[PDB]
Amino acid sequence: SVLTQPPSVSAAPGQKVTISCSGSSSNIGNNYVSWYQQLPGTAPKKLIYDNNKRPSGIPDRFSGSKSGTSATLGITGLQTGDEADYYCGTWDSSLNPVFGGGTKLEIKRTVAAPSVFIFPPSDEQLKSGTASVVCLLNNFYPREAKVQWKVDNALQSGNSQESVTEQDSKDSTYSLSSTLTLSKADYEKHKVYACEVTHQGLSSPVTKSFNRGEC
């Protein structure tokens, strides 16, 4: 990366955002600017070339301009499908391609509480000698969520890992998966396994638990 972009930007569907791209006189200052959209998992797709031109197939919701050593991508009529990383690109004083570090666009939506599900380890995993307990927080907003593991009422700390999806392209929510892993011997030393979820959309913490051996 060479060009400077803000890390993230956000707005509600139907509104406008702009994404800025800061460069120097030797790149943006003297050269055309392009903009790229990258949806999670895909290659960059070009939105803008020659500062302000749209390739065929890019709707006029997307626009670009350039002034001095800066450039700007504008996106009107925001849609949930616009959730993506956006990159500006230009050429340096050697006419080699340079890119900005990217901007993540987040769509603002109403608060949504997670649905919480818990998964005991499988018998198949248990026979292989380990036990992974999975807590699922499905479709929540905003992203901030807290998961606490308790085993026989003992707070687990440093014992688990979680990860979070990218924002859903259809309803702008997130989902979170948390895994607590134990050895088989340790799994068999305890009865109650519980995941406690805290989130803005819940008026009080939600707990899902099972007793080892009820299935």
């Binding site: 960059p44 690109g89 198949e124 979680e162 999806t165």
Partner: protein, 218 residues
């Protein structure tokens, strides 16, 4: 017009990364330029180099002593060699080309530079039960565990099931191996009539698994 990358998932430090891009639906000789761009994990885009119509090449100055880009007219391919790799070369590598205002891109291939070894996943079910039901909705899925390097791909019912699927970013466990889960939510009423299979492919170890996920008994 389609571009498709092929190449090693894992490369040992100080060895040579070698990638090819197969071009369909277009003649390699007809391209204006063909090139390579990479994206290290969680970071932006970095141009590696391009080769033009004439055969002339231009490389990123910071990489140029390690890079070779060439074209195979008979295979209708072009390639990238990057010698003496280190961990810093870990990245999703994209091929790209401009044909006769908008380049074509490959799909990207993740190359990991590491002195660790390849390891295939075990695939365990995340079985649905009352503990994974909320109303008329049930959650189920597959835990894809202890594999190296990334990536794995997961689909459901050979792609026929996509609505309500969430495949999470892998996590690097303290063992040095990755673990991933993929879940789907479905009507509870379907649990006894619809089969749910998660299709798992770990291309670096050549591990493919189709694992049926059946409701528990609690």
């Amino acid at each position: 017009v389609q571009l498709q990358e092929s190449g090693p998932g894992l490369v040992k430090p100080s060895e040579t990364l070698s990638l090819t891009c197969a071009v369909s639906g277009y003649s390699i000789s007809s391209g204006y330029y063909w090139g390579w761009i990479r994206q290290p994990p969680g970071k932006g885009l970095e141009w590696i180099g391009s080769i033009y119509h004439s055969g002339s090449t231009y490389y990123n100055p910071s990489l140029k002593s390690r890079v070779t880009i060439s074209v195979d007219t008979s295979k209708n391919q072009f390639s990238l060699k990057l010698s003496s790799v280190t961990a810093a070369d870990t990245a999703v590598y994209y091929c790209a080309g401009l044909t006769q205002n908008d380049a074509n891109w490959g799909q990207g291939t993740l190359v990991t530079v590491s002195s660790a070894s390849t390891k295939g996943p075990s695939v365990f079910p995340l079985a649905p039960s009352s503990k994974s039901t909320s109303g008329g909705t049930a959650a189920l899925g597959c835990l894809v565990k202890d594999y190296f390097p990334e990536p794995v791909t997961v689909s459901w019912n050979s792609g026929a099931l996509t609505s309500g699927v969430h495949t999470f970013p892998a996590v690097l466990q303290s063992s040095g191996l990755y673990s991933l889960s993929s879940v789907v939510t479905v009507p509870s009423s379907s649990l006894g009539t619809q089969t749910y299979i998660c299709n798992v492919n770990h291309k670096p170890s050549n591990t493919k698994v189709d694992k049926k996920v059946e409701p528990k008994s609690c």
